[PDB]
Amino acid sequence: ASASAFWLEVEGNSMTAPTGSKPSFPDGMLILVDPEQAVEPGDFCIARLGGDEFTFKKLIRDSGQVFLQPLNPQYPMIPCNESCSVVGKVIASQWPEETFG
Amino acid sequence: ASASAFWLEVEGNSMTAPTGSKPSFPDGMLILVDPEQAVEPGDFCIARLGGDEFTFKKLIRDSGQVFLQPLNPQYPMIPCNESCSVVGKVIASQWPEETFG
Amino acid sequence: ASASAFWLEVEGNSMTAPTGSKPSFPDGMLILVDPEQAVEPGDFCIARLGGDEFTFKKLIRDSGQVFLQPLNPQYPMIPCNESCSVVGKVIASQWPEETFG
Amino acid sequence: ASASAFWLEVEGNSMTAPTGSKPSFPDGMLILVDPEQAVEPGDFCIARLGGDEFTFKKLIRDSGQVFLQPLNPQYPMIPCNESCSVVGKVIASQWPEETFG
Numbered sequence: 203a204s205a206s207a208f209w210l211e212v213e214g215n216s217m218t219a220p221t222g223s224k225p226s227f228p229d230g231m232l233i234l235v236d237p238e239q240a241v242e243p244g245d246f247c248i249a250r251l252g253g254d255e256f257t258f259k260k261l262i263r264d265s266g267q268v269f270l271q272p273l274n275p276q277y278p279m280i281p282c283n284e285s286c287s288v289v290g291k292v293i294a295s296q297w298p299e300e301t302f303g
Numbered sequence: 304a305s306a307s308a309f310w311l312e313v314e315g316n317s318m319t320a321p322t323g324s325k326p327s328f329p330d331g332m333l334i335l336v337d338p339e340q341a342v343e344p345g346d347f348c349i350a351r352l353g354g355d356e357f358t359f360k361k362l363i364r365d366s367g368q369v370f371l372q373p374l375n376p377q378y379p380m381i382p383c384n385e386s387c388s389v390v391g392k393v394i395a396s397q398w399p400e401e402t403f404g
Numbered sequence: 405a406s407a408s409a410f411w412l413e414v415e416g417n418s419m420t421a422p423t424g425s426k427p428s429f430p431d432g433m434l435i436l437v438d439p440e441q442a443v444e445p446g447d448f449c450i451a452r453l454g455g456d457e458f459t460f461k462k463l464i465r466d467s468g469q470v471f472l473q474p475l476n477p478q479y480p481m482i483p484c485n486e487s488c489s490v491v492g493k494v495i496a497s498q499w500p501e502e503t504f505g
Numbered sequence: 506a507s508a509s510a511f512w513l514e515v516e517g518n519s520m521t522a523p524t525g526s527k528p529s530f531p532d533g534m535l536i537l538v539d540p541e542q543a544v545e546p547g548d549f550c551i552a553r554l555g556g557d558e559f560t561f562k563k564l565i566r567d568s569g570q571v572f573l574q575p576l577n578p579q580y581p582m583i584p585c586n587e588s589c590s591v592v593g594k595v596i597a598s599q600w601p602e603e604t605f606g
Contacts, residue, residue, distance in 0.1 A: 219329070220422035222477060228324075230325045232483060264581075266583070271317060273424065294397070296396060297395070299387065315464060317466045346480040352467065381469075417525055420529075428531045430524075444606070463573070498600055503528050504594070504596050
């Protein structure tokens with residue numbers, strides 16, 4: 203983790219995998235984002251979309267095209283082209299301490 | 304966390320909560336178990352059953368009895384009676400680093 | 405594979421995992437069943453239920469109880485007690501040759 | 506299968522068909538690719554794209570053009586034009602033995 207890494211809290215159910223699937227990042231978990239670490243296909247990342255909004259997804263590539271893939275099958279895949287940029291690689295994830303008291 | 308605390312890998316879907324529920328510990332996650340920390344009602348824990356096997360559940364009380372409750376409604380709750388002992392309180396949970404490449 | 409092993413064809417969608425999950429055994433695949441190989445928790449198997457009907461599921465154990473678990477979240481888990489018996493361990497699975505012509 | 510044929514692991518959900526469809530090649534499956542067997546329309550294959558990267562798709566023809574079609578409707582079809590070459594026909598597919606413990 204570089205000096206640029208920062209923690210974010212997962213929002214929504216787009217990265218919550220179906221029961222029996224892994225990994226899975228339910229709403230409420232914390233994820234560590236590191237801007238200084240490259241994101242390769244298969245890695246989890248934070249990406250910046252058209253409206254400059256941040257999104258937490260898995261970066262994948264198929265037939266030469268890059269997409270932002272959610273772990274929740276009910277959510278759509280997002281083409282990652284010119285208007286999209288990678289903010290950082292997700293390198294860690296844990297439940298906050300408070301979860302256990 | 305005491306020096307006796309140890310990490311364990313979650314196996315199975317018994318502690319995977321319904322999408323949207325908080326918290327959830329899907330198969331593959333790691334949990335930190337501290338034998339030296341008391342387990343109060345509502346706390347998560349590891350329990351030792353009569354078959355020298357273990358179970359990761361939430362400890363609850365009902366009708367003057369102790370029960371081990373799964374976060375997944377499809378799994379049955381078990382009475383933590385005589386032949387069942389608390390191993391330790393779960394005090395942390397995170398995805399193993401290998402999860403992120 | 406012992407001399408007792410035999411092939412079966414997967415029927416139905418109960419062992420078809422959600423998109424993005426693995427393993428998965430869609431209707432139409434072939435599975436190799438070996439009666440002479442023990443089935444341990446976590447293994448795939450063929451079990452014989454009350455009406456003596458065969459079922460292909462994952463054998464699991466939680467809190468001391470055995471269950472037959474389907475990979476398809478929409479299907480129910482089945483308690484595996486006295487009336488249920490393990491026929492054989494599933495040791496291989498492939499698409500039939502005809503699938504590719 | 507010729508001596509040039511080789512096994513490859515399926516990566517991604519692009520060839521995972523909708524539940525109930527036949528066939529389907531979910532992430533984690535192995536496919537046997539034979540460079541010495543011609544790929545006819547309707548056959549599955551491996552293709553080499555302009556980015557020295559590969560793609561596992563079904564080869565189809567349309568409007569006098571060749572296309573690589575994914576079994577998962579959420580992934581886009583790609584024209585197999587000039588800069589795209591067929592590597593070999595997929596002639597077999599199975600789960601790796603490690604899948605069964």
